[PDB]
Design a binder for this molecule. Structure first.
Ligand SMILES: CC(C)(C)NC(=O)Nc1ccc2nccnc2c1
Ligand SMILES: CC(C)(C)NC(=O)Nc1ccc2nccnc2c1
Lengths: 281, 281
C-alpha cells in the first residue's frame, strides 16, 4: 500500500476519511483535518497563512513529502453540498445565515486582492452538525492574486494592438466571477435545484449561462420570499460590470435582518470563548 | 558616483555607452554589450538561454548584484529606430530583408510558446553599419510564456460565470499582438511615418487603433509597391482571429523573393564562418 511521512506521524495520529482524513494532534489530543494532495499548492499555503477571517479556513500545519499534507481546523458539519444534494432544501433563514457569512468571507477576499474562482457547495464547510453554525470557505487551489495592462498603458500605444485597448473596458472585474458563483449557490440553497442544467432541456448548458436564462419553477419558488429571489436575480446578471458586488449584496434588503446578524455574532462569541485572553478594562 | 561588481570586472573591461555599455571580454579581447537593469529579469534570462535562433539576441553571461548586468552579443549597426527616425525611410528591398528576418524570429518565438509583447524599431538591432545585414530581436522584459481556462473547461460549468464561457471564443490568440506590432513596424519602415499618431489629427490615438483607420498619405505610398502595402493591410486587421499570422505573412507574395532569401542565407554563412567546426562528409 503506502505510509505517512515520519514528520507528520511525529506530530499527528492519523484516523478515518473526512483526499481528507481525520487526525489527532499529539500535543493537544485535539481533532484536526488532514488534506492529502498528490505530487500551485505552495501559493495556496501562502494565501491561507496570510488571510485571517472567521469564515475562511485556517491552515494549522504543512508537510511537503511524497505528497502534500495540509493540516486544517476540523469542520464537524462537513460540506454544504451534503445539505443541498438531491432536491434537499434549507429553510430560508438558514440560507440567509450561511449566505451572509459567504458574503463576508468573499468580501474579505476581494478587499485583500484574492479571487477564489471555485466557489461551490462542496467548498463551503459547516462548523457543527447543528443548523445554526459558522461556515468556512475552503479549496483555494484555483485562487488568483490581483498588472501587465497598467504597465502597457504607461507608454504611447503607437505599436499597441486594438484588442488590448478594447480589454481596458472590462479589466479589473475578474472578482465578479465569485459573485456569479455565490448567485448560483444561493439559488441551489433556496430551491434545492440548480439554475442551469442539462436535465429536461434542449438548450445547451453554455447557452443557458451566456443568455443568463435560469430555469424558474414557480411551484418551488412560491415557498421562497420575493426579497431572496431579487438578490439571486441581481447576482445572476450576465454583464460582470452590472453584476452585484459583495458590498451591494450585503446592503440588499434581504440581508437587512438584525435577528440573523445577532445569531451569527452569538456563534462567533461561542467559538472565540475558548481562545479569549483577559483584557485591559 | 558608483562602481561595477568585482565579478563582472573580473571577466570584462567596461567602456563607452551603447542602459547599454560596450565592454571587452578579458579571455577573448572581443567586444560585447552589457545591459544594466536597476534593482521578471530572471524569467527574461531563462527565456533567452532556452531560445536559439540567428534573429534572436543571445545572452553570453549574467550578473545579479546591486543591479542586473546582462552580457549580450554586440550589434554594431545599433537600433532600427535610428534608421527610421524623423521621416527617414528605407528602400523597399531593405524593408523586405529586415522584415523577413523579423517574421522568422517571431515565428520561432510563437512555435516555442513565447509572445514578445513589446516589438518596436527600438528593440530590433542591426548586426553591422551596412544596409544588408542580419537583424536580431531584443528586450524580452515584457514577454509572456504560453492555462487556467483549459483546467476550468474540464469540469461541469454549473457554477461557471458567463464571461468565462464568452472568452473561450478569443482564447489562445494573444500571439496576434506581435503580428499587429510587426504590421506597424513594416508601415514605418516603408513610409518613414507612423500609421497611428496625434500629429495633425482630431481623432484620438485610441480611436484610430480600435477602428483600424491608419493614416494613408498617397504621395508617400506611391513610391512603395502594392504587394508591400497589401501585407501591411493584412497585418493591420482589428480582429485578432482574422489578422495574418507569421506563417501567412511568410507565404505572402511580397516575401516570395528568391533574391532577398539568398542575400539573407549569405549573411548567415558569413556570420557562421567564424564558429564552423569541420564536418563528417
Ligand atoms: C460531517 C462528516 C460526514 C463527518 N464530514 C466531514 O466532516 N467532512 C469534512 C470534509 C472536508 C474537510 N476539510 C476541512 C475541514 N473539515 C472537513 C470535514
Ligand atoms: C551603432 C551605435 C550608435 C554604436 N549603437 C549601438 O551599437 N547600439 C546598441 C544598443 C543596444 C545594444 N544591445 C545589445 C547589443 N548591441 C547593442 C548596440
Amino acid at each position: 500500500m503506502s505510509v505517512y511521512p515520519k514528520a507528520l506521524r511525529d506530530e499527528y495520529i492519523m484516523s478515518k476519511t473526512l483526499e481528507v482524513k481525520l487526525a489527532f494532534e499529539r500535543k493537544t489530543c485535539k481533532k484536526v483535518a488532514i488534506k492529502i494532495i498528490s505530487k500551485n499548492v505552495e501559493t495556496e499555503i501562502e494565501i491561507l497563512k496570510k488571510l485571517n477571517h472567521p469564515c475562511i479556513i485556517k491552515i494549522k500545519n504543512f508537510f511537503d513529502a511524497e505528497d502534500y499534507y495540509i493540516v486544517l481546523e476540523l469542520m464537524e458539519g462537513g460540506e454544504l453540498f451534503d445539505k443541498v444534494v438531491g432536491n434537499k432544501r434549507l429553510k430560508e433563514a438558514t440560507c440567509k445565515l450561511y449566505f451572509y457569512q459567504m458574503l463576508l468571507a468573499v468580501q474579505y477576499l476581494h478587499e485583500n486582492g484574492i479571487i477564489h474562482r471555485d466557489l461551490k457547495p462542496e467548498n463551503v464547510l459547516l462548523s457543527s452538525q447543528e443548523e445554526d453554525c459558522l461556515i468556512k470557505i475552503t479549496d483555494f487551489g484555483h485562487s488568483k492574486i490581483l498588472t501587465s495592462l497598467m504597465r502597457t498603458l504607461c507608454g504611447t500605444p503607437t505599436y499597441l494592438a486594438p484588442e488590448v485597448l478594447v480589454s481596458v473596458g472590462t479589466a479589473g472585474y475578474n472578482r465578479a466571477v465569485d459573485c456569479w458563483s455565490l448567485g448560483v449557490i444561493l439559488f441551489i440553497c433556496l430551491s434545492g435545484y440548480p439554475p442551469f442544467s442539462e436535465h429536461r432541456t434542449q438548450v445547451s448548458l453554455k447557452d443557458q449561462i451566456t443568455s443568463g436564462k435560469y430555469n424558474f419553477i414557480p411551484e418551488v419558488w412560491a415557498e421562497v420570499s420575493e426579497k431572496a429571489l431579487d438578490l439571486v436575480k441581481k447576482l445572476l446578471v450576465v454583464d460582470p460590470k452590472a453584476r452585484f458586488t459583495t458590498e451591494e449584496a450585503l446592503r440588499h434588503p434581504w440581508l437587512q435582518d438584525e435577528d440573523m446578524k445577532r445569531k451569527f455574532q452569538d456563534l462567533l462569541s461561542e467559538e472565540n470563548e475558548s481562545t479569549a485572553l483577559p483584557q485591559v478594562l
